[PDB]
Structure 1
Amino acid sequence: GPMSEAADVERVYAAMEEAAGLLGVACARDKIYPLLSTFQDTLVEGGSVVVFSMASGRHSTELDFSISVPTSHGDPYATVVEKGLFPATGHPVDDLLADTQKHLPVSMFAIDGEVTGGFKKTYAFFPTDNMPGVAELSAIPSMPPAVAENAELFARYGLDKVQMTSMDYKKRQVNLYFSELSAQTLEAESVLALVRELGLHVPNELGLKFCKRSFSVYPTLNWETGKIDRLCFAVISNDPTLVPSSDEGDIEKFHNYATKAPYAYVGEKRTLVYGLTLSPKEEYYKLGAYYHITDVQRGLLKAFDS
């Protein structure tokens, strides 16, 4: 009843404080709780996906929390704007989540916030048995022109089906999360040519071996130019040692987080999603530790972590 529901949200907040504390990061409750409360239904429903994510380098003092939201709830961006939890940008990115649902089957939403800066992003998931390609995404009027402008490039590298998108309202950026990646797409020669053609940081062999393991690859695009801002390779695993860095500080920090981050499906091993992010000037690493998982993550582990 009402007690147990309120306690579930409190438990999620306490887990988020714990995860942030592994980084030395303090949590602002009056920034986080209104957002959690706004989406308390989704946190008690039980098909919940909740991830607490950290990053290396200049992003090392941030903790992001991502929470799935069913489409039955209605567009989550409209909710956060109408409740005053985020100021509308006045930019096409405001329209894009709604526009996407207007044009394509969306199977689920998600939101993302940071413990210090509050709400930052929304996600649109497509059904796994019915994902769009680049051409269908380009039919959405509020999609950045950059998506269509990079269509020939995406096709040349085998970046075809998109499992989900994300919208970053503060940076006015979109991520396309490509799925069903061929082995040719992820071989070293392909990844190198892609990264070089985009003008991004060239990885070393440790990074390339990580890339070969990827289950998802996501470029970031914007509405100002057709240049991709950065490119990320994602690896899902129960292995806590996979951060693709030779720096001992990174190796220790990520293993620490991967073995201590809170989660509620105790009796299983933690689901981890690692990221290798390449921008024009730098490489950096990400690690989301899932607090709540579903069959989707378990299936990805079976397919990609066996």
Structure 2
Amino acid sequence: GPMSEAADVERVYAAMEEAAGLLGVACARDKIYPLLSTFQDTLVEGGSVVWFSMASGRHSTELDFSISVPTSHGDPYATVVEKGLFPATGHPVDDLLADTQKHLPVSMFAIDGEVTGGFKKTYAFFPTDNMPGVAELSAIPSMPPAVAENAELFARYGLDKVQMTSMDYKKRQVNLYFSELSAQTLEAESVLALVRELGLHVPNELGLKFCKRSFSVYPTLNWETGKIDRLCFAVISNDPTLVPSSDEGDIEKFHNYATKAPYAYVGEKRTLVYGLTLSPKEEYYKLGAYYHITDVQRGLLKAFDS
């Protein structure tokens, strides 16, 4: 009832504080709870997907949280704008989530915030049996011109189907999460030519071995240029030791997070998503640990963590 639902949201917030405490990060309740309350039903109803994400390097003092939102709820960006939880940008990224649902079958949404900065991003998921390609994504008028401009490049490397997209409203960037990756696409020669063509940090063989394991690859694009800002390879696993770094502090900090991050599906092992992110001037590491999982994450583990 009303109290049990209110307590669920307290529980999610307490887990957020726990996860943030593993990094030494303190949570700003006044930035987070209004968001949690606005989306209380999604956290209560079930089918929830919630994950808490950390990063290495110059990003290590932040904790991100992402919370799934059903399409039946309606565009969660319009919600946060109308409620005053985030100021409208005045830029096409404002339109992109709603525009995407206009033009394509969207199976789910998600919202994402940082524990000290509040709301920052939305996601659009597409059905696993009905994913768009680049050409269909570029039919969305508010999508960055960079998508269509990189179509030739995406096709040449076999980056075709997209399982979801994410919109960053503060940086005005879009991520395209490519799926159904072929082994040719993730072979070291292919990855090397890709990152070299994009002018990004060249990984070593440890990073390449990680890339070969990826279930998703996502470039970041923006509305100002056709240049891809960075590229991330994502690996899903129950294994807590997979961070692709040879730095002893990284190895320790990520294993610590991967073995202590709060989660609710006790009785199973934590679902983890590692990311290897290549930008022009650096390489850094991400780790999301899911607090709430569904059959999708279990199916991905079976396919890619076996």
TM-score by length of 2: 1.00
Distance in 2 (alpha carbons) for counterparts of 1:70 and 1:131: 17
Distance in 2 (alpha carbons) for counterparts of 1:298 and 1:79: 30
**2:130 maps to 1:135:** no
Distance in 2 (alpha carbons) for counterparts of 1:185 and 1:149: 20
> What is the match of residue 224 of structure 1?
224
CA distances 1:105-153 after superposition (whole Å, capped 9, x unpaired): 0000000000000000000000000000000000000000000000000
> What is the match of residue 254 of structure 2?
254
Distance in 1 (alpha carbons) for counterparts of 2:188 and 2:171: 30
Which consecutive unaligned segments of at least 5 residues does structure 1 have?
none
Q: CA deviation at 1:244?
A: 0.1
Q: CA deviation at 1:279?
A: 0.2
The root-mean-square deviation of aligned C-alpha atoms, in Å, is 0.2
Distance in 2 (alpha carbons) for counterparts of 1:111 and 1:217: 20
Distance in 2 (alpha carbons) for counterparts of 1:72 and 1:49: 16
Distance in 1 (alpha carbons) for counterparts of 2:58 and 2:42: 32
Distance in 2 (alpha carbons) for counterparts of 1:46 and 1:267: 18
CA distances 1:27-69 after superposition (whole Å, capped 9, x unpaired): 0001000000000000001100000000000000000000000
Distance in 1 (alpha carbons) for counterparts of 2:104 and 2:47: 22
Q: CA deviation at 1:207?
A: 0.1
Secondary structure of the 1:130 match is coil
Matched-pair identity in % = 100
Distance in 2 (alpha carbons) for counterparts of 1:302 and 1:227: 35
Secondary structure of the 2:42 match is helix
CA distances 1:248-271 after superposition (whole Å, capped 9, x unpaired): 000000000000000000000000
Distance in 1 (alpha carbons) for counterparts of 2:45 and 2:274: 27
CA distances 1:138-182 after superposition (whole Å, capped 9, x unpaired): 000000000000000000000000000000000000000000000
Q: CA deviation at 1:9?
A: 0.3
Q: CA deviation at 1:191?
A: 0.1
Secondary structure of the 2:146 match is helix
TM-score by length of 1: 1.00
CA distances 1:203-259 after superposition (whole Å, capped 9, x unpaired): 000000000000000000000000000000000000000000000000000000000
Distance in 2 (alpha carbons) for counterparts of 1:152 and 1:29: 45
Which consecutive unaligned segments of at least 5 residues does structure 2 have?
none
